Each structure stands twice: as structure tokens, then as C-alpha cells.
Ligand binder design. Structure first.
Ligand SMILES: *[C@@H]1O[C@H](CO)[C@@H](O[C@@H]2O[C@H](CO)[C@@H](O)[C@H](O)[C@H]2NC(C)=O)[C@H](O)[C@H]1NC(C)=O
Ligand SMILES: *[C@@H]1O[C@H](CO)[C@@H](O[C@@H]2O[C@H](CO)[C@@H](O)[C@H](O)[C@H]2NC(C)=O)[C@H](O)[C@H]1NC(C)=O
Ligand SMILES: *[C@@H]1O[C@H](CO)[C@@H](O[C@@H]2O[C@H](CO)[C@@H](O)[C@H](O)[C@H]2NC(C)=O)[C@H](O)[C@H]1NC(C)=O
Ligand SMILES: *[C@@H]1O[C@H](CO)[C@@H](O[C@@H]2O[C@H](CO)[C@@H](O)[C@H](O)[C@H]2NC(C)=O)[C@H](O)[C@H]1NC(C)=O
Ligand code: NA
Lengths: 454, 454, 454, 454
């Protein structure tokens, strides 16, 4: 078949060779430049909206913490607590008293929403007695709510139950108007902050942490976006059909190649020669194509009705734009100078992934060994996730002297954990910097030397 | 002997070759997968207990420091001291006054244990007189204890002896009940905190540091563990007998090989050919086997009676689990692609250990040179351990600009230590990053090239 | 042409060969040593002036912040704000009251300049009402200035408009005399500080930041420089004519080489053989020559009349001195041992720049992916510039554990961004340290091996 | 000459070959093991004395800062200053009032030494007038001392001259007794602290920094060392004569080799063959030998009379011990496996030192370019030393994100320095990590490959 050879001349032909031979063929290549530009501009333009929204969220939450938390200096979100009995009464009474006089205090136009509800939660049959070691506990949790309305004995005389206490929560809402939007020449977005001050007594340890949490329900008051957002799906869908048409030809031209080796007696050639016939780049491009058109329909559903679930939308558009940019490495491999550079990973990957298991095992071994031993006597090694972040930080070198000095300052309780800590940390750091990183260098150099000489 | 050749065909045979030839042989290999799973699950399940115990320890100790230490802001454990005469009286009197009214203050159910005992320790014949330089010192240390019982002149009128003073210690106990255990659906663990507030006057320098230390005596109040903890020793002992049986065959089949070369006149072959006959992996597996069965019997002795010595138990189980995971590199070397990767250290180790001595000497030389010279004029170089941690941190690069700026900010006392500090630090950092790390890279690359071509 | 061959013997001849053959030829080489010394001494002598000027600027600005800002502890320039209504009145009234009694307070000789003007700016028709969601806004900004003269009702009774407020600015000037100049034995420089205290209400979020800014107008009161500053331009201009004369010979001797290959039928030789004939070092030297003579005329215009625009002057002299020092690598390549070392980049540059695009794309991909996703739930990833600085810091390893712990401490809002953060950060750090840095090492080693064997 | 060949057989013979041939020759080698042990034990034993001395110095200096400085919280040595007029009067009056009542306040036995002298220094003819710009200055500095004797108008009514003020210094002495020495079972060391509180008004900027400095005059009150300190000089002198005897033989056996090539007509062989005949290790050993015997005589002169100049003594003993440890690399090169490892630097050094100049030039170029440009607008780049420490810290990677964020937070004054800062820092970091470190790796690998194959 002299035509099918001429097809395979044209199937493996680069478009540069095809342009200098045929001409008038940008029909595939113009899309994959437009699609890069259209997706990334859509990403940046959407990414500048969340700067204004999140900074107007964060500044209002800080301005709530100075108004409703007693004695709050900044940079102390974690080590802020109430320890005696009177500090908890003062922290509650200050919050409600700073709520009731809010227009004569604050600096924004914080209106009210019809309001405040105080509630404590205590065990039903609580009986704790360390002198006699007697317990008789019903674990049913009963609440005791107090209603407070804004414009003392309706609110005061609130006696807590410190011998059985779980949470004391304060819940109220505030409504305000973004005034920056008129400077940005648009229709405003009236927000609704939902504040939940939490006094936690979960561990029953006499250390009650205090924290404040907000939540916004964005809504309009009493088109460069939507025209562009149908362009980003029209381009991407047109590429989704045009690329799938090419893989459809790839499967069918593969299929009449499998036909010949039953007539030429090619002994039913296995997975190797048929992997050298289907492009792999269109796989990455089509799995970019699904994610962009999913995320933009999601974004239409965001701005229309539900201004909350930015999570799935952002995690799809960012991963789509990540996969589209790597699809420009497609263009570079048509040159005979880049073609050495891109072919350095196709031979190393079935060896460097073989070595990555041998590193991941030993790394996981030092994770389990370090976490149980240096769990109690150290602060960087509490949970297994935090051990994994600490040991992976120490490899490139982030925080060595802090991990050493935190061990030396207390020396554990006895000298056996300190003498173990010296051998543990020195052997682990000396292993992965010298003998393991070096092995990785040797593998990539040998894989490059395999590509260079032929 | 045609049978002994057929034994050596079967002795060096991989189990993959043995399964594809014989079949029905998982009898060795099923243990070393079960033993990985059983040990590590036992480790994680024991490792989650100490999270609840240690966090209930640490939160109660912080809640003691806010209640009994005068003017304690957090993050100031080391630079907390008493300097004048009245600050020490106020720091003692505040601690006892905050002890006597403890139920009307604290937030836990801290009961008392029959109580408080104040005691100061002073030299018998103390005579310090810098005007006349006269000393007449009996170094016998006499205590002066005060008994305080909880429900002023029994406690007040406590005049210290500031011209001869060693320690002022306050000792008392508190008993409480963990209430988190009922949420975790079990029998509680009544703790007993033992508090020792220490006012140290050891160096006699007018800087008395203040610190608080606790100690717990865990005891029950007035079975997924123990069934699993006999599985972890039954599996490991069965592997301890089954592996030792294999090394017993290895020594005996070695022994009748030594017999032949006295009849074949093999001239009493030395240590090389007989090292190529005994496996080394069973050595690591059997020294895992001793440590697991020692640590779990230790853990039974922990939870039954003595809830204190977690040190030896944790340092054995963690090291055992460390050696079991590295024993999965055993499995990878049966493939002819991993067999290049694992053979990169067998030839480098009698050369990279030859180079590790040449690095450890020069490193130790900069330790002794830096510690005496930059001892006084610098804060990172106090003890020799702290010099070793600082110089080893600077190699990968942790804290360079802090070590430079601490030198520049004072410039020592004169410019000779600063001009020495610049030459010391620049020559040391430039030595081990460029010329020494590079040598390590060259050694591993040459060792890989020795394995690759044959 | 036997003479033109003898010219090309002399044109490519090194001056070391030319000195050992001819002698009495330093006429080119003495300039390029003098020009290094003259430029760098001019740089250091100018660079020591700005130490005295800027430290006398910074110390006076700190001394203004302690005098005019209410409750200012150092290291808190960013988290200094006013949150309630009364804190803003106290922060304004404290600043003007500390202005009027300034000679009986301060420690310098701060005189007055005829003075203080307070001004607030508010919207004309401001109507914000979150209860009814009604707005009727004229965005014209009207000021309301108050005049205050130094030696209460002229200044007091200043009622702000908190429901429509943009800026409250305080502007005044202070004149002082540098007394360090008499110790430095010269004519003094009377400064004029121009202070602008700013109360910003741009975002309308109830968080008003406070900051103080100064500006100096240096002027003399009521010659080693200028003699040296004409030497630095006389030397550099003489090199500017002497080097351009050599490139003029280079173009003309190239031109009569292009003539021959039309008579010898050399087929109009392209860009390669004619690039091996023009020196590239004189290009760097002449673009040093333009920048030095531009910056020093600029510096004359600075010290004569306009003591403000140090920006263009410094950015030209520093870049000129940067290009002059690299012009000493010119001297080293005449030796046959350095000639291997300098020839390691001429062959790698059309391959390592080919690889730098393949790294810059993937790096830019992780920038766009990380910024939108971890924008809201993280503080290091606010703007795209700050993402680029954070991801480039993590490659060599700067701040890994802070970026991990800031993610773990809040876990976002839900676990999907945390589970995305672990995969994002681990894949990105493992990519550029192991597989990409290693590729760079392999390229430079192969480029050196290309130069070494021939 | 068959004997001189037999000498050269014995001259280049290793002692291992000489022991297995001759025997009873430890006469050279026993010294160089004893000398390592004797010097380092002398170093450690002297190095443990300065821990007790310097910590008794530092704790007393901190205890002075809490007693004599008004409002001193720790960690604030640099940002502690007095800004108004009344803060300087209160800082002086608090220091003298806390001096006069010192036994009823402090916790040590601080006696007095006959005492306190207050003194201020002001210009004689001071005339500063920014309204009229008139100056008439006599730079002669006149002091005004006040005498204060310990057991108000003798001390009060101290009117400063704020319009001409240089320093206000307070000087007094305190004597105490180290009581730790009786616990260490010895004769005590009565110290004499010399305190100099300094109020600096050098820059005349209205920011007066405050700092306290002490100085000790150690003296005894009203032998494992000295026996060992003559051993360390007896051993080292005996090696100083025994090694110089060997180099004396080396010069003389070289001399009768130069004789032969005038009779054999060897054409007066140059520096190469005569460098392959003199050992280089005895040069390092003899320059260790001078420094040890100098430093220990210095140490005798320290402990006898002058307990001050620890500078020259420590900087000689530390450098001597540095050179003695590297002299154990001498021993390793006798083995034919280490002999490849030690020979990796003899061929690289006349090439890696050729490359170190090409790096030091470009590094110095970025130092001069960065210091003038980013001098004013940045805090890490003030002096040229601090630029060199900052740029050298950024290469291995220490403090990248702090240097980037300090630039971004202010953006200079205008955007031109910020746009210059991005290009400066990115080009410099990308240059030395990728292209320059990689070049270093290639040089050491090629130098190892030159040694490996022959
Ligand atoms: C305070 O404690 C109560 C429990 O006593 C919490 O109520 C639980 O809330 C979670 C939702 O996060 C539910 O799944 C549980 O079923 C609730 N338990 C009960 C008994 O209601 C309450 O959420 C806590 N407060 C805060 C702010 O977390
Ligand atoms: C306070 O100082 C006394 C000594 O004056 C300490 O008592 C010593 O304690 C250790 C145990 O750690 C014993 O080995 C010594 O023999 C004890 N000496 C005497 C004289 O009793 C006491 O422990 C110190 N206080 C604290 C809390 O450490
Ligand atoms: C306070 O806000 C006003 C605007 O209400 C600022 O005035 C603007 O200043 C910039 C110059 O930086 C001009 O380009 C604008 O046209 C000005 N707008 C108006 C309405 O005048 C003022 O600069 C702000 N104060 C400070 C200190 O920045
Ligand atoms: C306070 O300032 C005076 C100068 O007014 C300093 O006196 C100088 O001290 C140095 C020694 O360090 C001498 O070289 C100078 O000659 C002295 N000058 C005069 C005029 O006496 C004094 O040292 C400063 N105080 C401190 C603590 O440094
Ligand atoms: Na750091």
C-alpha cells in the first residue's frame, strides 16, 4: 500500500515541515495559542476579584477582634485564653456590652440584623469528685439560651456551671455596605457578617481558648464578564471536538495497522510498537479541555446565585491553567536542539520512579521512628503530618538550628532521648544530602548520556 | 556432587523463579508482609494514645504557670527572673496565696492531696565580705522547712537569708480527673500532678531564674489492646525461629563447602568467597525480631503497673519499625532494573566511608577552633555541642545571616575577633559547599559508572 | 596579499605576544586598569556620603514617630491602627498638642517654618443606610481645612464625619541644622523635613491605619570632589574614543574581507565567519563608557542645584561599575589554563538558554495555579508578585516550614484546600530540586566535556 | 652511587613498609599521636574555664541592666532610647537613686569601691539657630563633673545643656566575690565590675541611645594546670627540633642531587623535580609547633599577672589546634584506597583557584552595584560589609523572603528601584546557583577522572 505509507509520511510530519511543503495549514495550531491566551486572561481577571473580596473580609474580621475580644493585641491568635474564673465573666460581659453601644463606637456603618443569642452547654447529670472518685454521668448535652435584643437583669445574673461546661457561644449578625464599589464604578455588594465567638472547654484542662469566626453572605443591593465567559467555553469546546477527531483518526489508523500483521504474519505485535503511534500530548490537552468547561459553568453558577463554594471552582480553573501552560512544551520539541533536552525524561522516568520508591520507604521509616520517640519531648513532632513537614523541610535545609536548640534547651527529661536525638538527626540529614541526592544526580547524568551519543 | 550443585541452584534462587518453577511456596514471604502490617498498626495505635496523654499534660502545666507565677506572659520561659529583693518576696507570696483560694479561682476540678511545704536552703557558716575579703565557710547545707495546710503568721514572717541562699522550693500536689475519657467511652485515668516551683540562686549573680515543673502519677479510678499485643509477639517470634533456621542451614551449607577445598586443595579460601554465601538481610530482620518482642513485653509492663518509663519502650519500638521498613528494599532487588539501583552503595561504601573520615576530621577542627575563640564574644557558640549544631546547620544553610549579624552588631570587643570571624566563616562555608560536596558527587557518579557498564 | 595576512597575524595577536615581540605598547592596556581604579574609587567616595545622609534621615524620622504618634512601640509600623471612635480623636489631638509645645519637649533644635494645616476630606452627598439599602452619592470630594499657628477653640470642636470619610491629613514643616558637619570639617547642610501624618479610610472597613512620612529639602546654610569628577569623565571619554577607533578598524578590515570572497568566489559567506572577527568585549566596554559619563554629569547636576533625584544617578553608576568589573575577565583568557575555564559558557549558552524557557514555563504554571487557589486561605500568596517571590524562595529553601504550618494551623476552611496544598507543595519542591537542578548539572558537565577533549 | 639509591629507597619509604622491613621504629610516629592528644586536652581543659568565667560575667551584666536602666525589658538592647526632655532626666535620676540604696535592693553581695562620678560634655561656644542660620562654634569640649559619695542638692539641680550636648556618662565600680568557686573547691576570684552608662548624643538627631558596659579586673582574694602546661611545650619543642632535623636532611640530600646534574649534564633542572623531593606536611607541622609554644607561654603570662588579653592567646591556640587535626590526613595517604581520595585536590587546586578569581570578581561587582542603589531604600544593605554578608547568605539560601518582602513592603519611594530590585535579585540568585555551582561540580569531576584512570 503506497498510499498508507504516504499517510504515515504525513501523520508523523511536523507542522513546520508541513507548512514548508503544503502551506495554508494553521487550522490546528491557531487554537492552541488562542486557548492559552483566552484561559489565562480569564484566570487573571477572575483572580483580581478575590483580592478585593478577601481583603475586605480580612480587614473587617480584624476590626471585629479589636472590638469584641477583651485585651487583644495582634499576632496572638493562638496564645489567647482565659485561665481564672473572673476572666471568663469579663470576656463575655465585655463582648455583649461592646455589642449594645456599637454605633457610638465603631467606624463603619455596621447596622443590625434582627438578634444576639448567648448560649452555654452543660452536661445533664454532672458529678465530678476527685476526693471520692465518684462519677454518675449522663452524656446528654442540654443548652441554656439567653435572648438579647439591641435598641441589665435580662442579660446579667448569668451563672455558669464550671464543673460541667463544654462551650459558651455568642452568635449575632451584622450588615454593611461595600463603599469601594462606587469608586470601582459598579453596583454595590451588601455583605452580611455572621459572627460566632467561641469559648471552648473541650479538654477540661483549665485553659479555655477564645476565638472569633465570621462568615459572609454576599448579595446585591436593593458586561465584560459574561460575554468573555462564553468565549472561554466556545474556544475550549471547539478544541475538545477537534482534538478528539484527531485521536479518532489515530485509533482507526492504528486499527488497520493491526490488520496487516495478521496478513503479513507479524505475530500480533504487543504494546510497544502501538505505543509509538498515539500521541500523548492530546491526552493532556483533552484533560485540560474538560476542566476549563466544567469550571466556567461552575463560575456562572457562582456569580448568579451561590456566592459561597469558591473551592471547587478555584481548584478546577487553577489545575486547568497548570495543564495548559505545560502544553507549550509541545512546541519546543520540533527543533533538533530542544529535542535532546526534552528527551532527557522519557528514559529516566522508568528508572527515577524506580528509585523514588527506595527513597519514600526510608523517609517513611524515619517518620514513624521520630514521631513516637520525639513526640512528647518536642514541639515540632506532634502529629504525623507535622513530622512529615518537618523532616521534608530539613532536607533542603529550613529550620535545623531551631529543631536542634528545642531539643537541647530541655534535654528531654533524661539524657537518653537527647543522646538518641543527636544520632537520629545527624544520620538522617547526612543520609539524604550526600548519598541520596548524589544518586539522583548520577541517574539524570547517565540518562542524558544515553540520549546524547546516538 | 551433582545434588549439592542442585542445592546451590535452589539456594541462590529468587522466590519469583522458585514460584514459576515449583509453586505453592509463600511459606517464608507471607510472614514478612504480615509482620510489616502488624508492627506498624501496633505502632500507630500506641502512638495515638500519647497524643491525648501529652496534650492533657502540657495544657495543665501551662494552666499552672498562669495561676502560680507572678506576671507570666507566654513565650518567656527562659527570660523570666527576679532581680530586686521585693520581687522575690512577691513571687513567693503570690504563689501560696493563689494556692489557698484555688477552688474559687481555677476552672478545673483541682482537688487537694494531704500539703504544701515551703523550704529554703542556706549555708551554715556563711561569711561573705568584699570589703575585707574574709571567708569562713562550712559547705554543709541546712534546710528550713515551713508547713502550710489548706482549708497568716503561720506562713508569713518568712525572712530569707540573701547573703547565703541556694534554693527556695515550693512543693505540693494536685489531683484531677480526665473527663475526656467518658467521651472516648472508657474508664477514666485520675492524674496526680506534682508541682515543684524552683527559685534558683546557684551562680550567686543576682539573677534568680524562676521555673515550674510537674510530674504525673497516672492511675485508674475507684480489649482491642491486649489481644492485639499478643499477635504482635506471636508473629514476630515465629519469624524469629523461621529465620534462624535459615541461617542455621546457611552455616551448615557453608561448612561442607569448607570441607571440599581441603580435598580439592582450595588452599583454605579466606573471608571473601564465604561472605558471598551468607545473606545479610536476615541479620537486619533478626535484629528487628529481638527489638519488637522486647518492646511489647515492656509495654505490657507499662500499662499494667508502671506508667512512667515510656523512654526505653518508645526507643525500642521506633527503632524496630525503622529497621522493618528498610527490610522492604529486600523485595525490590529481584528485578533487573532495580538491581542496578540497589548496587550503587555496595561499591561506594568502602570508599565513601573512607572519605567520611577525611571530612569528619576537618569539621572537628573547625569545631575546636571556633569554640574557644568565638566563645565569649558570641551567643551561638557557648558549648561544644552548640558549636557542632551551629556549624552543621550552616552547611546546608540555615541561619547564616543571624550568625553574621550577631558578630557585626558588637564587633566583639576589638576588631581582631571580627577580622578573624570574617575569615573563619567565609573559609568554612566555601570549603564544604563547593570543594567537599562536589567530591561526594564525583564519588557516587564513579561508583554508579562501575556498576552500569558490566 | 601577504601584508593583509601579516595584519591578521597582528590583529588576533594577544598583547602578551605583542609585548614579547614588539615592546613599548601599553597604550591600550593602561587605560583599562586606570578606568577600573578611577571609577570604583569615585563610587566608594560617593557611596560614603549617602551613609551619613540617610542615617541622619532615618534617625530623625524615628524621633518624629515617637513624638507625634500616640502609643508607638517600635517594630509595629504595619499593625498600628485606630479602631474605635475615640482613638481617632485622641490620635489627632495628641499630634497637634505635641506640636505646639515642641521646644519644651524635643532634644534637637527643631525650629518652625511659617504653619500646621489640618484637613479632612469627605463626600459631598453621602447617604449610606444598610437598613433601607439606599444610596445617593456624589463622588466629588470636598476638603475642610483648619489653620493652626504656633506661638483652643480655634483648633478644637473639630467634628469629623465618620459615615463619609476618606483621609485626615496633618501637614507641617520643621527646619534643623546638621551639627555632625562641623565635626566633619565642612559647611553645614540645613535640612527641611516635610511631615505628612495620614489617617487612611480608603477601604471603609473600620480599620484606619496610621503612618507618618517625611521629605527633606537639603540646602546649604546662610574641593576633592569636583577635581576628581572631571578626571572620571576625562579618562572614560578618552577610552570612548580609543575603543570606537578600534571597532572602526574592525568594521573596515571586515569590509575588505567581504570584498575578496566575491573575487575568490566565496559565495557571500554568512553570519558565522564574520562573527568570528569582531570582538565582543569592546561592546561591553563601550556600554560602560556611555553610562559613566552620563551618571557623573547627572551627579554634578545633583550637588549643584537639585538634591532629590538620586534614583537615576545611582542606578546608572552602579550598573556601570557592575559592567566594568566583569570586563576584567577580558584579561584572564590570554592564558592557556583559564582558556578552558572561560570557554565553558560559549557552548552552553545556546543550550542552557534553550532549557531556561522550559523551566520558566513550568514555574509560571505553578504561579498561576497557586495564586488563585491558595489566595484566600493563606497569607504568603496574596498578589502574583508575592507568589513569585515565595515560590522562588522555596527552591533553594528559605521558608518551607512557615508555609506549611500556616496552611496546617487553619486547614483552610475545609479539608479540600489542605489536601490540595499537600500535593501542590510536595510535587513542586520535589520537581525543581531533584529532576530540574540535576538536568542543569548534566548540561554544564557535557558542555565542559565538549571543550576539554579537543 | 649505589648507596644514594639505597638512601632514596629509604627516604621515600612509608613507615608501614619500614616497620615491616626494619622494625623498632616508632621514634617519629609516637610524637605525632601524643602531640594531638596533649594539645587537644590542654585546649578543652582551658576551654571549660571560660564557660564559668563568661557566664558569671554575662549574668551580672544583665542583672545590672535591670537595676540601673529605667524600664528595661529584655531583647531590646538596640531599640532602647530617650526621646523627650523628661525621659533623659528620669533615666539619669533613676540610675543614681538605684545606686545609693543598693544593699537594700540587690541580691548579690555587691560592695562599694571608693565613688560615683557623673559628667556631661558640652561645646564651649555653642550657637545653633535655624531661624537665622548663624553659627559661631568653638569645637573644644569642656566637661562638667559631679562627685557623688555613697553612705539631695549635692546631686540634684543638674541642668543639662540640650542645645549643645555630646555625652552624659555615669562611672562607678562594684566589687563582689564568686561563691561558685568554693563549690568547685578552690581559692575564690574577687571580681571588680567597672560600669559606664552612656547617653550618646553624637548624631544630634533627637534620638539618644542608652547602653551599659562593664569591665572586670579579676584578682585573687586576701596544680593540675602548671604541671600539664610544661608538658604541652616540652612535647611540642621536642617535635620542633626533631622535624627541623628532618628538613635539614631534606635540604642536604637535595643539595647533593643538584651537584650530580652538573656532572651528569642535567642542564640545571628547575623548580619541578626539586618540589617532588621536599615534604609539605612538615611545613604545616612546624607552623603548628611555633603557635602552640607561643600560646602557652602567653597563657602563663595570663594566669600569673594579666587576666585581660585573652584575645591573642585564644586566637593562637585555636589556630594551632586547627592545624594539628588536619595533620592526621598525613596518616591516611599511606593506603592505596585513600591515595585516590587525597589526590583529588593536588590537580584541581591550580584550576579551581583559577576559577575562584572569576567568581570573586563577579561577586564583588554585585556588591558595588547593590550597595549604592539599594543603600537608602533597604535595611540589609547599609554598609559594604553587610552587603557582603547578605549576598553570601543568599547563595546557599538563608533569608531570601525577608530581603524580598522588605523591598515590596515600601516599594522604595518610586517604582524604578523596585523594578530594578526584581531584576537584580533574580539574576544574581539564578547565576550562582545554576551556572556557577554547576561549573564547580564539573571541575572536581574532571579532576577526579584525571586521577582515577592512571
Ligand atoms: C460546643 O459543643 C457542642 C457539643 O457539646 C457542639 O455541638 C456539636 O456540633 C457538631 C457540629 O460541628 C455536631 O456534629 C454535634 O452533634 C454537636 N453536638 C451536640 C451535643 O450538639 C458545638 O458545635 C460546639 N460549639 C462550637 C462553636 O463548635
Ligand atoms: C536546691 O539546692 C540543693 C542543694 O543546696 C539541691 O539538693 C541537691 O539535690 C541533688 C539531687 O538533684 C542531690 O544530688 C544533692 O546531693 C542535693 N544536695 C543537698 C545539699 O541536698 C536541690 O535539689 C536544689 N533544688 C532543686 C529544685 O534542684
Ligand atoms: C486622601 O484622599 C484623597 C482623595 O479623597 C487623595 O487625593 C488624591 O491624591 C492623588 C495624588 O496621590 C490624586 O491623583 C487624586 O486626584 C486625588 N484625589 C482628590 C479627590 O483630590 C489624597 O492624596 C489622600 N491623602 C494621601 C496622604 O494620600
Ligand atoms: C563622649 O564624647 C567624648 C567627646 O566629646 C568622648 O571623648 C573622646 O574619647 C575618645 C576615646 O574613645 C578619644 O579618642 C577622644 O579624643 C575623646 N574626645 C574628647 C574631646 O575628650 C567620650 O569618650 C564619649 N563617651 C563615650 C562613653 O564614648
Ligand atoms: Na530562617
Amino acid at each position: 500500500e503506497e498510499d498508507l505509507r504516504r499517510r504515515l509520511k504525513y501523520f508523523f510530519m511536523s507542522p513546520c515541515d508541513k507548512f514548508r511543503a503544503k502551506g495554508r495549514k494553521p487550522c490546528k495550531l491557531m487554537l492552541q495559542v488562542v486557548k492559552i491566551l483566552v484561559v489565562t486572561v480569564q484566570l487573571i481577571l477572575f483572580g483580581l476579584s478575590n483580592q478585593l473580596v478577601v481583603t475586605f473580609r480580612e480587614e473587617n474580621t480584624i476590626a471585629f477582634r479589636h472590638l469584641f475580644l477583651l485585651g487583644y493585641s495582634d499576632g496572638s491568635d493562638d496564645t489567647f485564653a482565659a485561665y481564672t474564673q473572673e476572666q471568663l465573666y469579663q470576656a463575655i460581659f465585655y463582648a455583649v456590652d461592646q455589642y449594645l453601644i456599637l454605633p457610638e463606637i465603631s467606624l463603619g456603618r455596621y447596622a443590625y440584623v434582627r438578634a444576639l443569642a448567648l448560649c452555654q452547654r452543660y452536661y445533664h447529670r454532672g458529678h465530678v469528685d476527685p476526693a471520692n472518685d465518684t462519677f454518675d454521668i449522663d452524656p446528654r448535652v442540654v443548652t441554656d439560651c439567653i435572648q438579647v435584643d439591641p435598641p441589665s437583669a435580662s442579660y446579667k445574673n448569668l451563672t455558669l456551671k464550671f464543673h460541667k461546661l463544654i462551650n459558651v457561644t455568642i452568635h449575632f449578625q451584622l450588615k454593611t455596605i461595600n463603599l469601594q464599589s462606587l469608586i470601582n464604578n459598579e453596583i454595590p455588594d451588601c455583605y452580611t457578617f455572621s459572627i460566632l465567638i467561641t469559648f471552648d472547654n473541650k479538654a477540661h484542662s483549665g485553659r479555655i481558648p477564645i476565638r472569633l469566626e465570621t462568615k459572609t453572605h454576599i448579595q446585591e443591593c436593593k458586561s465584560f464578564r459574561l460575554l468573555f465567559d462564553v468565549v472561554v467555553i466556545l474556544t475550549c469546546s471547539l478544541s475538545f471536538l477537534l482534538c478528539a477527531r484527531s485521536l479518532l483518526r489515530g485509533f482507526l489508523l492504528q486499527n488497520e495497522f493491526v490488520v496487516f500483521m495478521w496478513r503479513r504474519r507479524g505475530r500480533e505485535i504487543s504494546l510497544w510498537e502501538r505505543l509509538e503511534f498515539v500521541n500523548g500530548w492530546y491526552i493532556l490537552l483533552v484533560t485540560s479541555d474538560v476542566l476549563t468547561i466544567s469550571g466556567t459553568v461552575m463560575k456562572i453558577g457562582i456569580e448568579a446565585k451561590n456566592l459561597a463554594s469558591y473551592d471547587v471552582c478555584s481548584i478546577l480553573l487553577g489545575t486547568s491553567t497548570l495543564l495548559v501552560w505545560v502544553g507549550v512544551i509541545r512546541y519546543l520539541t520540533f527543533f533538533h536542539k530542544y529535542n535532546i533536552l526534552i528527551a532527557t525524561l522519557r528514559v529516566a522516568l522508568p528508572s527515577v520512579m524506580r528509585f523514588c520508591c527506595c527513597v519514600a520507604v526510608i523517609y517513611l521509616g524515619y517518620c514513624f521512628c521520630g514521631w513516637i520517640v520525639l513526640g512528647p519531648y518536642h514541639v515540632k513532632f506532634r502529629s504525623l503530618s507535622m513530622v512529615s513537614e518537618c523532616l521534608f523541610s530539613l532536607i533542603n535545609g529550613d529550620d535545623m538550628f531551631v529543631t536542634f536548640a528545642a531539643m537541647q534547651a530541655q534535654q528531654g527529661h533524661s539524657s537518653l532521648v537527647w543522646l538518641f536525638s543527636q544520632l537520629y538527626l545527624y544520620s538522617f540529614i547526612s543520609l539524604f544530602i550526600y548519598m541520596v541526592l548524589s544518586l539522583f544526580i548520577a541517574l539524570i547524568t547517565g540518562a542524558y548520556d544515553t540520549i546524547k551519543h546516538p
